[PDB]
Design an enzyme around this catalytic site. Structure first.
Site, PDB file in Angstrom:
ATOM      1  N   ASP A  35      51.903  24.694  69.260  1.00 48.72           N
ATOM      2  CA  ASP A  35      52.714  24.478  68.075  1.00 48.72           C
ATOM      3  C   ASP A  35      52.156  25.231  66.880  1.00 48.72           C
ATOM      4  O   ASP A  35      51.197  24.773  66.236  1.00 48.72           O
ATOM      5  CB  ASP A  35      52.776  22.977  67.757  1.00 48.72           C
ATOM      6  N   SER A 199      61.983  36.827  55.873  1.00 43.17           N
ATOM      7  CA  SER A 199      62.920  37.689  56.564  1.00 43.17           C
ATOM      8  C   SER A 199      63.743  38.467  55.546  1.00 43.17           C
ATOM      9  O   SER A 199      64.008  37.986  54.453  1.00 43.17           O
ATOM     10  CB  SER A 199      63.840  36.843  57.444  1.00 43.17           C
TER      11      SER A 199
END
Length: 330
Positions: A35, A199
């Protein structure tokens, strides 16, 4: 040194991925959920409340000659999906794909929430976010990657998650046969303890690319792709019959639909998520309403590039003095 381990979807939907981890001497092998959105290595154990164990493999510290109770230490964690666990702490030898760390904090669960109990396939979590998020008290502990870093050939690990198929976590090297083209690297902020990046935009299907900054986290421990409501609405508007259902808890779509791809930007580069990756199947057994793999982050407080996004790429988690993230197509 390096390590290389295969990671395998837990079910036919790729709800999560498990990776075998050797703990203790002799080794006890547990299948852990790696994770990158948390920083605790915790396991079902001989100390876990018996009624809260249902099929998981447990770590038994008393059977490990290298286990040592970390005196006074406790841990307690709550995850974005409302699940939680807590317990005490041992140090022991931990190996992943041939890479060994001695004195790793292994957090032994005394209590786990129902969702953990109900998932027989996940024996615990291995956190790979920054050690500043580690919950051990009163002495915060380091992640497996943090402990291994100085010994690694290169201070990196890579995630290569498969779509309905196994994939690989590598430590200490970049497998140049595992991706196509070049790796595009992008800046990371460690200020919230996550692999947080921005992004450069998105496209829906064969549509034009929208240049827009989307700050989010690269999180292998989250199944879906959580993005701003505007982006998500634009995606599902291209699927006839799709709608956001408050009763189901997100966007659903007719199971008869052919889903469009979704592209996200990494600098000037582009990662394309095929439409099939965005199908998470019937909302309930036998339903013709299917759950979407792109959902709104509104009210999460952060955008999450979860498995839906990451499995479309070869992803480099670069733990150099100034960390960065790299993405390549594959």
């Amino acid at each position: 040194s390096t390590g290389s381990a295969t990671t395998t979807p837990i079910d036919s939907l790729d709800d999560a991925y498990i990776t075998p981890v050797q703990i203790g001497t002799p080794a006890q092998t547990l299948n852990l959920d790696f994770d990158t959105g948390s920083s605790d290595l915790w396991v079902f154990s001989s100390e876990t409340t018996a009624s809260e164990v249902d099929g998981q493999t447990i770590y038994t510290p008393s059977k490990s000659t290298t286990a040592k109770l970390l005196s006074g230490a406790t841990w307690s964690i709550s995850y974005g999906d409302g699940s939680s666990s807590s317990g005490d702490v041992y140090t022991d030898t931990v190996s992943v794909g041939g890479l060994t760390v001695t004195g790793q904090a292994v957090e032994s669960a005394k209590k786990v929430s129902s969702s953990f109990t109900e998932d027989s396939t996940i024996d615990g979590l291995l956190g790979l976010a920054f050690s500043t998020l580690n919950t051990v008290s009163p002495t915060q502990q380091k992640t497996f990657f943090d402990n291994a870093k100085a010994s690694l050939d290169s201070p990196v690990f890579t995630a290569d998650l498969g779509y309905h198929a196994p994939g690989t976590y590598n430590f200490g090297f970049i497998d140049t046969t595992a991706y196509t083209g070049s790796i595009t690297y992008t800046a990371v902020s460690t200020k919230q303890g996550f692999w947080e990046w921005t992004s450069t935009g998105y496209a829906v299907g064969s549509g034009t690319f929208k240049s827009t900054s989307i700050d989010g986290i690269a999180d292998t421990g989250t199944t879906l792709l959580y993005l701003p409501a505007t982006v998500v609405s634009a995606y599902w508007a291209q699927v006839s019959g799709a709608k956001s259902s408050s009763s189901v808890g997100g966007y659903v779509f007719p199971c008869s639909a052919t889903l469009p791809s979704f592209t996200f930007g990494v600098g000037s580069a582009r990662i394309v998520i095929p439409g099939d990756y965005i199908d998470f199947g019937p909302i309930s057994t036998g339903s013709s309403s299917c759950f979407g793999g792109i959902q709104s982050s509104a009210g999460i407080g952060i955008n999450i590039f979860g498995d839906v996004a990451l499995k479309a790429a070869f992803v480099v988690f670069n733990g150099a003095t100034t960390p960065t993230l790299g993405f390549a197509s594959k």
